[PDB]
Amino acid sequence: ERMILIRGLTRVITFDDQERELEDADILIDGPKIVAVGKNLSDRSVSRTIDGRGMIALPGLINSHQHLYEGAMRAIPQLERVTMASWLEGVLTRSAGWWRDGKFGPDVIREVARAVLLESLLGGITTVADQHPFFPGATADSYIDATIEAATDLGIRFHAVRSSMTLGKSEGGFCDDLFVEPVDRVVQHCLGLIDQYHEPEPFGMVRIALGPCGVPHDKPELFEAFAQMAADYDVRLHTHFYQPLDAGMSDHLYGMTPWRFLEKHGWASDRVWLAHAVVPPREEIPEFADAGVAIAHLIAPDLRLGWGLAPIREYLDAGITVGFGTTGSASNDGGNLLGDLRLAALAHRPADPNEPEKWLSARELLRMATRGSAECLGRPDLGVLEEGRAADIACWRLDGVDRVGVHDPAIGLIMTGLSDRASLVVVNGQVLVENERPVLADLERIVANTTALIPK
Numbered sequence: 313e314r315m316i317l318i319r320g321l322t323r324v325i326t327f328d329d330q331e332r333e334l335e336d337a338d339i340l341i342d343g344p345k346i347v348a349v350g351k352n353l354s355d356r357s358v359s360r361t362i363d364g365r366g367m368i369a370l371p372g373l374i375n376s377h378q379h380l381y382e383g384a385m386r387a388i389p390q391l392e393r394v395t396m397a398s399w400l401e402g403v404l405t406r407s408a409g410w411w412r413d414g415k416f417g418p419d420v421i422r423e424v425a426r427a428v429l430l431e432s433l434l435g436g437i438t439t440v441a442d443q444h445p446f447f448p449g450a451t452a453d454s455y456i457d458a459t460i461e462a463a464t465d466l467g468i469r470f471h472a473v474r475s476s477m478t479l480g481k482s483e484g485g486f487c488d489d490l491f492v493e494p495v496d497r498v499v500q501h502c503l504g505l506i507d508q509y510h511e512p513e514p515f516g517m518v519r520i521a522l523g524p525c526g527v528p529h530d531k532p533e534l535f536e537a538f539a540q541m542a543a544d545y546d547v548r549l550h551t552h553f554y555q556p557l558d559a560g561m562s563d564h565l566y567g568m569t570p571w572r573f574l575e576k577h578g579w580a581s582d583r584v585w586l587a588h589a590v591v592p593p594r595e596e597i598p599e600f601a602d603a604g605v606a607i608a609h610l611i612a613p614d615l616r617l618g619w620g621l622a623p624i625r626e627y628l629d630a631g632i633t634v635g636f637g638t639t640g641s642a643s644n645d646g647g648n649l650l651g652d653l654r655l656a657a658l659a660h661r662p663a664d665p666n667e668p669e670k671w672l673s674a675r676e677l678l679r680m681a682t683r684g685s686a687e688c689l690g691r692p693d694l695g696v697l698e699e700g701r702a703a704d705i706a707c708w709r710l711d712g713v714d715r716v717g718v719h720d721p722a723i724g725l726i727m728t729g730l731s732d733r734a735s736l737v738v739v740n741g742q743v744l745v746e747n748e749r750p751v752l753a754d755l756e757r758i759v760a761n762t763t764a765l766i767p768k
């Protein structure tokens with residue numbers, strides 16, 4: 313029950329309510345939580361002191377949108393340069409194919425998940441929300457059991473978002489039958505997951521969320537069902553939102569915009585975070601704000617697929633919560649959240665060539681990647697370095713030869729570097745990464761084991 317002191321961090325970014333930062337300052341940790349953050353903290357009941365000099369410390373990064381199983385689908389030549397339709401076909405085909413060859417069972421997803429999750433820790437990411445949409449077998453298989461098992465073995469904080477594709481081509485869908493589950497099978501399964509896995513209490517390490525793939529891909533019955541289940545069991549709701557084709561598909565199936573559809577079917581609530589949000593009607597943005605939905609900025613796939621730049625400034629101006637994420641590795645293709653912030657930092661600028669004040673700043677992006685994401689996930693106990701909050705902490709060295717000359721360390725973190733490898737990472741008060749290495753997980757063994765299971 314003994315504490316941990318991180319002493320003399322060169323810079324500490326808190327993202328508390330004042331955006332306080334401190335210099336040559338400490339973080340005191342006791343079990344799952346932060347006890348204090350400030351200069352010259354007492355080592356009174358401390359059983360280990362960690363030398364933070366030369367480091368910048370942030371709240372642990374929170375990846376608010378992953379698809380772990382896609383770790384197996386990286387850097388496929390056929391999928392290097394493809395639009396959404398071909399990409400979606402390519403991933404679905406591969407996952408369905410590997411699955412009926414017996415090459416993609418929950419045992420495989422578990423080890424893919426273990427690799428990408430460990431990569432995540434090493435990149436300073438302390439919480440991941442994975443959306444798994446793939447459940448063939450008639451009895452919905454243990455894919456989420458498998459990702460939760462990897463997360464738990466690793467000690468990374470975890471949100472399991474049970475996804476689906478419930479709208480088939482026989483109803484106007486762009487999927488297939490092997491992945492199309494009846495709505496009731498999705499709903500039954502979700503209930504069992506909550507009861508078995510959900511840790512609603514503060515500092516909870518595993519939580520469940522309900523996440524249809526999207527309005528073009530799922531039945532309204534599912535959304536309404538989930539809206540009921542979310543209020544009955546106090547869990548959260550997640551889906552994709554305003555991908556370029558969606559407005560057209562939503563109007564064709566239902567005669568309304570994707571937002572108006574969500575509104576109708578119970579999803580205009582503070583009960584919701586929404587992935588991408590690339591091309592909304594501007595007129596709807598103030599409505600996102602009053603509804604209290606949050607939005608996850610996913611720059612890497614938005615660029616990768618040719619979709620472009622989501623109006624993040626507008627969301628910020630409207631007071632909408634904005635978080636950040638990588639998405640799956642079939643459309644990123646890495647799980648490197650920190651690197652992806654540099655992508656956003658730069659790619660937004662050409663869209664407002666003469667109004668640099670509109671450009672997202674390093675600190676606004678770092679906020680998205682911590683506090684913003686914590687809020688997307690409904691976690692007031694994460695995303696902030698201050699007393700009472702979770703001791704989830706990520707730190708990077710500032711004294712490498714590739715960061716010589718850096719005047720502001722936080723900007724430096726986005727704008728410079730050969731490597732996004734974190735030095736020191738703490739989750740739920742447990743040191744998981746030190747000197748850029750895992751201290752509990754066996755790195756080489758995990759690389760070997762997962763590599764052996766990746767399908768040809």
Ligand SMILES: [Zn+2]
Nearest residue numbers: 379587639640
């Ligand atoms: Zn996604």
